[PDB]
Design a protein around this ligand. Structure first.
Ligand SMILES: [Ca+2]
Lengths: 87, 87
């Protein structure tokens, strides 16, 4: 499984994808360095999460990305079209 | 916002789509009639959720869909490739 965020960017830059992860990390109180297997592919950011004490899951992180969607958009200048988990 | 389930069937049939919703409903102990605004679009099923006695959310229902993906697949023959929330 991997997490993803689909944006309106064609294509999404690597820098912007990492900024999304920085904001998300701050909200889930973890190091942005706990996001692994990162790539941007077309308009999408994909990632996994490293083992952690907190037991934070991909589910948890994508739910969180919905909770703070407005903040993610405001701080990055992009639009988030989908957030989910792929197989 | 809407919830979605992306399959490996293009076009996804409406009947197959709502069969996914029935299995999902059984799993989360909600009536499938609480899934509203339903459409199939390409390989995807999209929906929203009405007031329900269980007070359940889109992130929660789509996370659960991810959890029971092998059941959804065993019962329908579809593969579930993504689950998430869109705008
Ligand atoms: Ca928006």
């Amino acid at each position: 499984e991997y997490g993803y965020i689909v944006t309106d960017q064609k294509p999404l830059s690597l820098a912007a994808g990492v900024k999304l992860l920085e904001i998300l990390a701050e909200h889930v109180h973890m190091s942005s360095g706990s996001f692994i297997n990162i790539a941007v592919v077309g308009p999408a950011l994909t990632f996994r999460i490293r083992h952690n004490e907190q037991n934070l899951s991909l589910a948890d992180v994508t739910q969180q990305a919905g909770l703070v969607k407005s903040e993610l958009e405001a701080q990055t200048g992009l639009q988030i079209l989908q957030t989910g988990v792929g197989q």
